[PDB]
Write a protein that holds these residues in place. Structure first.
Motif: not given
Ligand SMILES: NC(=O)C1=CN([C@@H]2O[C@H](COP(=O)(O)OP(=O)(O)OC[C@H]3O[C@@H](n4cnc5c(N)ncnc54)[C@H](O)[C@@H]3O)[C@@H](O)[C@H]2O)C=CC1
Ligand SMILES: NC(=O)C1=CN([C@@H]2O[C@H](COP(=O)(O)OP(=O)(O)OC[C@H]3O[C@@H](n4cnc5c(N)ncnc54)[C@H](O)[C@@H]3O)[C@@H](O)[C@H]2O)C=CC1
Ligand SMILES: C[As](C)(=O)[O-]
Ligand SMILES: C[As](C)(=O)[O-]
Ligand SMILES: [Zn+2]
Ligand SMILES: [Zn+2]
Ligand SMILES: [Zn+2]
Ligand SMILES: [Zn+2]
Ligand SMILES: [Zn+2]
Ligand SMILES: [Zn+2]
Lengths: 207, 206
Positions: B133-147
């Motif tokens: 919200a503060r930074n006007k982010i367009d795209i989140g890149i998910l690189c975490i484990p699955k659970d």
């Protein structure tokens, strides 16, 4: 080059994944039409693609045949060159192992990393890679090193007898024509996100 | 879903790569024959793809493709998961050069907070929604484990992320106004096993 066109070949792993998803939700059969809807390929193109290999669809049988078509009933001995961030990410993806890709060794030039354990393999000095390839009948080299003078490393794999290179570097590697070179471009996926973010506008403009 | 069909859209970046390389090579024009070869696409298919929007001017077609792909704009991205894959993505500076400016990296691992990557520092993921919200982010890149990754994607979505570039081999649910692009490296690898096994396959088929 290949008996079957690359355009078809590149659709095969997508059919395979999608059929895996159906087989795992116990779905018994799938029509040409549902299949085409999901894949974004015409029903008649899907027929044609599959026709290269023999004669809607029984899900388990099509799955099994695609597993075969894709060579996934065989074992490939692999190594990873570059035990940095990308190389370790690939090494830890154990789903490739279950599909027949057996990780036999991982190589780096950084003595910090020598002896590090990833799954059941230890990082070794890349100095020994050519020997290792021939000793261990290595089929595939996965290349996850920085780009600078990378051709030289490629050349070492090729002259040791590697059969294929899975290349993540953003350059053009030169390999002899009998060696399979598969180049990864994650940008090709990323740029469809920018496309879709702007598609509505784009069209506002054109009309 | 999309105005143009996904099959056309998936060939565009590959056209753009090839034209880009012709440029760096100082090549100015390119016959549809010699173009079509490399694309391993039919001149006629190349034609019909562009038709949604004798030879080709290289810089022209390139600039047109840059605009079609939205690559004349700038996107703010974050990376969720500061492990091996998230750091490999962070350090790939070509995306940056293409308009994908990395604003933040997030993790749960207290031992990473403040760790410096390129010009970014790793932050606690508990702060990710405020950041967005503060930074006007367009795209989140998910690189975490699955659970429990679905929960993380919900956070990104509730907070107003427009798009998710997912590396996790699961099916995320997002609402119909969020873009979800899933990466499957196996789609590239399984063409190497196909090619190695192809002669054997066609001997055995006959
Ligand atoms: N294809 C794509 O879409 C993407 C490609 N990449 C590329 O993948 C490659 C690896 O990226 P990262 O792991 O982030 O870099 P990194 O710096 O974390 O790892 C590179 C590793 O290679 C080792 N190395 C350097 N020269 C070597 C040699 N001659 N032989 C064996 N090992 C050597 C280094 O010691 C380091 O351990 C880079 O070329 C990067 O640009 C990264 C992200 C996406
Ligand atoms: N799509 C594909 O073809 C591939 C997918 N992958 C996948 O990408 C993911 C990342 O792989 P690696 O980086 O090798 O794993 P990793 O275990 O090295 O890193 C995961 C990081 O995420 C952090 N984390 C865990 N839950 C979190 C959360 N909710 N929010 C923020 N951070 C969290 C951990 O502290 C850790 O730093 C895995 O799911 C892996 O299976 C990996 C290779 C290829
Ligand atoms: C992966 As390629 C042969 O289109 O650079
Ligand atoms: C890349 As997909 C939406 O077919 O999992
Ligand atoms: Zn040497
Ligand atoms: Zn390339
Ligand atoms: Zn090239
Ligand atoms: Zn998937
Ligand atoms: Zn799916
Ligand atoms: Zn919404």
């Amino acid at each position: 080059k290949t008996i079957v066109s690359m355009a078809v070949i590149r659709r095969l792993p997508r059919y395979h994944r999608y059929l895996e998803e159906l087989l795992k939700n116990d779905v018994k059969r799938i029509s040409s039409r549902e299949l085409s809807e999901k894949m974004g390929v015409t029903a008649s193109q899907i027929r044609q693609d599959l026709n290269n290999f023999g004669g809607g669809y029984n899900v388990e049988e099509l799955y099994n045949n695609l597993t075969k078509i894709l060579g996934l009933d065989k074992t490939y001995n692999t190594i990873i060159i570059g035990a940095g961030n990308l190389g370790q990410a690939i090494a830890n993806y154990t789903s490739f192992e279950k599909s027949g890709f057996n990780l036999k060794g991982i190589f780096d030039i950084n003595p910090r990393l020598f002896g590090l354990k990833i799954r059941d393999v230890e990082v070794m000095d890349v100095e020994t890679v050519e020997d290792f390839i021939a000793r261990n009948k290595i089929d595939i080299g996965i290349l996850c090193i920085p780009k600078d003078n990378a051709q030289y490393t490629a050349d070492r794999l090729v002259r040791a007898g590697i059969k294929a290179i899975w290349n993540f570097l953003p350059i053009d590697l030169k390999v002899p024509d009998d060696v399979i070179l598969e180049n990864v471009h994650l940008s090709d996926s990323l740029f469809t996100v920018s496309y879709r973010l702007n598609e509505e506008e784009l069209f506002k403009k054109l009309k």
